[PDB]
Amino acid sequence: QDPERVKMMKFVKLAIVLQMDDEEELAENLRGLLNQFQFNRKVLQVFMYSLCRGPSSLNILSSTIQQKFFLRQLKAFDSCRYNTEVNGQASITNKEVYNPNKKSSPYLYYIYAVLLYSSRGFLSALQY
DNA sequence: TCATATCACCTGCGTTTCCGTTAAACTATCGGTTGCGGCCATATCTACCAGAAAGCACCGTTTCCC
C-alpha cells in the first residue's frame, strides 16, 4: 500500500534474481521496472549493467520481444519530443519530461542500437 | 348399648395411584450480524498474423571459352 515501499521492493527483488541463472525471471523483473520508471536514465543503466555477461544476457537482448518493447518506448519519447501521435507508441506515463531543445534521449537510441547489433542487424545498428 | 355375619343399594367423603404443573441444566438447530471475494468494466500491452516493396535464389539461353 506504500508507493515508496513498492519501488524499493522491486529493486531488492531484482538484486536477488541477478544471482540465479533464471533468464525468464530476470527478463520479467526488468520489463516491470521499465514499464514503471519510463524513460528513466538510472533504470536504463541498471537494465544494461544487469545484462553485462554471458549467453543468458545476450538471449534477453537478442529476443524479438525486447526489440519491440524498446521500439515502443522510443516512439513514446519522440511523441513527448514533438507533441504528435506516433503509431504504436507506449502510453506516456512519465509526463514530467522537460526537453525544450527537442534532443534525442541518447540512452534510448543507444539501447536500441545495441538490441539490433546483438541480433546481427548491422545495417540497422549503424543508422541509430 | 357395643362386639360379628350377609345383602340389596346410591350417594357421599376423601381417599389413594400415574399424569401434569412450575421451572431446572443441558440440548438442537438456525438467525441478526460480523468479515470476506466473484463477474465484468476500462485503458493499456501484447501474441499471432498477412501484405508490400524489395531480396535472392533456382535456372538455362546465350556465346565465349575447354
GROMACS .gro file of C-alpha atoms (C1' of nucleotides) in nm:
model
  194
    1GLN     CA    1   0.000   0.000   0.000
    2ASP     CA    2   0.301   0.241   0.019
    3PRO     CA    3   0.440   0.379  -0.315
    4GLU     CA    4   0.789   0.429  -0.163
    5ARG     CA    5   0.793   0.068  -0.037
    6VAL     CA    6   0.675  -0.093  -0.365
    7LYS     CA    7   0.958   0.094  -0.551
    8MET     CA    8   1.216  -0.034  -0.302
    9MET     CA    9   1.068  -0.384  -0.307
   10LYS     CA   10   1.104  -0.427  -0.688
   11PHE     CA   11   1.474  -0.329  -0.685
   12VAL     CA   12   1.559  -0.559  -0.390
   13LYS     CA   13   1.377  -0.847  -0.571
   14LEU     CA   14   1.580  -0.785  -0.890
   15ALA     CA   15   1.909  -0.777  -0.697
   16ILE     CA   16   1.845  -1.130  -0.563
   17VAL     CA   17   1.725  -1.253  -0.909
   18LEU     CA   18   2.064  -1.143  -1.059
   19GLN     CA   19   2.247  -1.418  -0.859
   20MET     CA   20   2.045  -1.711  -1.007
   21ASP     CA   21   2.059  -1.808  -1.379
   22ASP     CA   22   1.678  -1.779  -1.437
   23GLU     CA   23   1.659  -1.584  -1.767
   24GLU     CA   24   1.279  -1.556  -1.780
   25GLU     CA   25   1.261  -1.428  -1.421
   26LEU     CA   26   1.530  -1.164  -1.496
   27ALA     CA   27   1.356  -1.062  -1.818
   28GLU     CA   28   1.014  -1.022  -1.646
   29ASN     CA   29   1.155  -0.820  -1.350
   30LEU     CA   30   1.339  -0.585  -1.590
   31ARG     CA   31   1.024  -0.542  -1.806
   32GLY     CA   32   0.827  -0.449  -1.492
   33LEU     CA   33   1.073  -0.173  -1.387
   34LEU     CA   34   1.096  -0.036  -1.744
   35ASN     CA   35   0.712  -0.019  -1.762
   36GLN     CA   36   0.705   0.168  -1.426
   37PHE     CA   37   1.000   0.417  -1.447
   38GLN     CA   38   0.954   0.516  -1.813
   39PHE     CA   39   1.248   0.696  -1.986
   40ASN     CA   40   1.448   0.700  -1.655
   41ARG     CA   41   1.831   0.711  -1.702
   42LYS     CA   42   1.933   0.532  -1.378
   43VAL     CA   43   1.686   0.249  -1.460
   44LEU     CA   44   1.810   0.218  -1.823
   45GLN     CA   45   2.166   0.180  -1.689
   46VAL     CA   46   2.054  -0.085  -1.434
   47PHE     CA   47   1.898  -0.270  -1.731
   48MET     CA   48   2.221  -0.283  -1.937
   49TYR     CA   49   2.450  -0.348  -1.637
   50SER     CA   50   2.214  -0.632  -1.530
   51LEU     CA   51   2.282  -0.773  -1.880
   52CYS     CA   52   2.670  -0.736  -1.896
   53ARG     CA   53   2.781  -1.109  -1.927
   54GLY     CA   54   2.715  -1.446  -2.091
   55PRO     CA   55   2.467  -1.612  -2.329
   56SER     CA   56   2.185  -1.562  -2.074
   57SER     CA   57   2.203  -1.184  -2.111
   58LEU     CA   58   2.254  -1.197  -2.490
   59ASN     CA   59   1.937  -1.413  -2.518
   60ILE     CA   60   1.744  -1.130  -2.345
   61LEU     CA   61   1.875  -0.853  -2.575
   62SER     CA   62   1.854  -1.064  -2.895
   63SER     CA   63   1.484  -1.161  -2.839
   64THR     CA   64   1.225  -1.004  -3.077
   65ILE     CA   65   1.012  -0.923  -2.769
   66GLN     CA   66   1.284  -0.686  -2.642
   67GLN     CA   67   1.326  -0.522  -2.986
   68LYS     CA   68   0.950  -0.444  -2.999
   69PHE     CA   69   0.937  -0.328  -2.635
   70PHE     CA   70   1.215  -0.071  -2.680
   71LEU     CA   71   1.083   0.048  -3.017
   72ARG     CA   72   0.757   0.143  -2.841
   73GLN     CA   73   0.929   0.343  -2.564
   74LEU     CA   74   1.148   0.518  -2.826
   75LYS     CA   75   0.829   0.616  -3.020
   76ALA     CA   76   0.674   0.738  -2.692
   77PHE     CA   77   0.977   0.959  -2.625
   78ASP     CA   78   0.954   1.103  -2.979
   79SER     CA   79   0.586   1.177  -2.904
   80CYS     CA   80   0.687   1.386  -2.596
   81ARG     CA   81   0.971   1.545  -2.805
   82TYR     CA   82   0.745   1.665  -3.095
   83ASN     CA   83   0.385   1.672  -2.947
   84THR     CA   84   0.228   1.424  -3.203
   85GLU     CA   85   0.067   1.076  -3.213
   86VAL     CA   86   0.316   0.804  -3.332
   87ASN     CA   87   0.167   0.467  -3.443
   88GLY     CA   88   0.212   0.200  -3.169
   89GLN     CA   89   0.373   0.439  -2.912
   90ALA     CA   90   0.369   0.331  -2.544
   91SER     CA   91   0.143   0.541  -2.314
   92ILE     CA   92   0.326   0.848  -2.174
   93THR     CA   93   0.341   0.751  -1.804
   94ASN     CA   94   0.635   0.989  -1.736
   95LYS     CA   95   0.474   1.324  -1.837
   96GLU     CA   96   0.740   1.513  -1.629
   97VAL     CA   97   0.990   1.535  -1.927
   98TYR     CA   98   1.148   1.879  -1.996
   99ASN     CA   99   1.330   1.889  -2.335
  100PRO     CA  100   1.297   2.245  -2.480
  101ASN     CA  101   1.574   2.189  -2.744
  102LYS     CA  102   1.393   1.871  -2.884
  103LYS     CA  103   1.704   1.645  -2.826
  104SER     CA  104   1.703   1.265  -2.861
  105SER     CA  105   1.744   1.050  -2.548
  106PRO     CA  106   2.098   0.915  -2.612
  107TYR     CA  107   2.025   0.621  -2.379
  108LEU     CA  108   1.715   0.509  -2.574
  109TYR     CA  109   1.888   0.539  -2.913
  110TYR     CA  110   2.196   0.360  -2.774
  111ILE     CA  111   2.000   0.069  -2.621
  112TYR     CA  112   1.801   0.033  -2.945
  113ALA     CA  113   2.130   0.022  -3.146
  114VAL     CA  114   2.257  -0.249  -2.904
  115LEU     CA  115   1.937  -0.458  -2.942
  116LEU     CA  116   1.978  -0.456  -3.324
  117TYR     CA  117   2.357  -0.513  -3.318
  118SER     CA  118   2.330  -0.800  -3.067
  119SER     CA  119   2.087  -0.970  -3.313
  120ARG     CA  120   2.308  -0.925  -3.627
  121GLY     CA  121   2.118  -0.626  -3.775
  122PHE     CA  122   2.440  -0.432  -3.855
  123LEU     CA  123   2.286  -0.202  -4.118
  124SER     CA  124   2.017  -0.104  -3.868
  125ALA     CA  125   2.271  -0.056  -3.587
  126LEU     CA  126   2.471   0.196  -3.796
  127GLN     CA  127   2.157   0.408  -3.858
  128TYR     CA  128   2.079   0.465  -3.488
  129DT     C1'  129  -7.592  -5.018   7.431
  130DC     C1'  130  -7.133  -5.208   7.160
  131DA     C1'  131  -6.890  -5.685   6.974
  132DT     C1'  132  -6.951  -6.031   6.446
  133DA     C1'  133  -7.207  -6.248   5.972
  134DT     C1'  134  -7.490  -6.101   5.499
  135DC     C1'  135  -7.704  -5.844   5.114
  136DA     C1'  136  -7.979  -5.518   4.818
  137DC     C1'  137  -7.810  -5.047   4.726
  138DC     C1'  138  -7.663  -4.482   4.584
  139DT     C1'  139  -7.475  -4.134   4.720
  140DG     C1'  140  -7.109  -3.934   4.953
  141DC     C1'  141  -6.649  -3.848   5.163
  142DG     C1'  142  -6.167  -3.813   5.077
  143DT     C1'  143  -5.912  -4.100   4.988
  144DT     C1'  144  -5.511  -4.334   4.724
  145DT     C1'  145  -5.203  -4.422   4.242
  146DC     C1'  146  -4.976  -4.242   3.743
  147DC     C1'  147  -5.009  -3.779   3.488
  148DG     C1'  148  -4.947  -3.255   3.496
  149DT     C1'  149  -4.767  -2.846   3.651
  150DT     C1'  150  -4.382  -2.482   3.752
  151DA     C1'  151  -3.919  -2.438   3.614
  152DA     C1'  152  -3.410  -2.672   3.623
  153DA     C1'  153  -2.927  -2.793   3.330
  154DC     C1'  154  -2.821  -2.929   2.930
  155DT     C1'  155  -2.967  -2.973   2.433
  156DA     C1'  156  -3.053  -2.886   1.860
  157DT     C1'  157  -3.083  -2.609   1.545
  158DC     C1'  158  -3.080  -2.165   1.293
  159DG     C1'  159  -3.084  -1.602   1.270
  160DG     C1'  160  -2.905  -1.091   1.326
  161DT     C1'  161  -2.487  -0.966   1.222
  162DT     C1'  162  -1.994  -0.997   1.165
  163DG     C1'  163  -1.581  -1.050   0.765
  164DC     C1'  164  -1.458  -1.197   0.347
  165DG     C1'  165  -1.415  -1.223  -0.257
  166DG     C1'  166  -1.677  -1.347  -0.799
  167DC     C1'  167  -1.804  -1.109  -1.274
  168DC     C1'  168  -1.718  -0.761  -1.557
  169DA     C1'  169  -1.583  -0.279  -1.696
  170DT     C1'  170  -1.172   0.007  -1.863
  171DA     C1'  171  -0.704   0.162  -2.098
  172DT     C1'  172  -0.320  -0.041  -2.189
  173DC     C1'  173   0.016  -0.407  -2.357
  174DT     C1'  174   0.075  -0.793  -2.616
  175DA     C1'  175   0.061  -1.263  -2.933
  176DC     C1'  176  -0.022  -1.423  -3.375
  177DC     C1'  177  -0.080  -1.287  -3.833
  178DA     C1'  178  -0.077  -1.103  -4.353
  179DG     C1'  179   0.060  -0.791  -4.707
  180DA     C1'  180   0.447  -0.480  -4.994
  181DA     C1'  181   0.829  -0.333  -5.159
  182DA     C1'  182   1.213  -0.541  -5.211
  183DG     C1'  183   1.573  -0.969  -5.154
  184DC     C1'  184   1.773  -1.364  -5.376
  185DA     C1'  185   1.799  -1.758  -5.514
  186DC     C1'  186   1.696  -2.155  -5.877
  187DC     C1'  187   1.752  -2.176  -6.354
  188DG     C1'  188   1.904  -2.202  -6.882
  189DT     C1'  189   1.952  -1.924  -7.309
  190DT     C1'  190   2.338  -1.720  -7.460
  191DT     C1'  191   2.821  -1.735  -7.672
  192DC     C1'  192   3.268  -1.729  -7.547
  193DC     C1'  193   3.569  -2.033  -7.393
  194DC     C1'  194   3.766  -2.608  -7.295
   0.00000   0.00000   0.00000
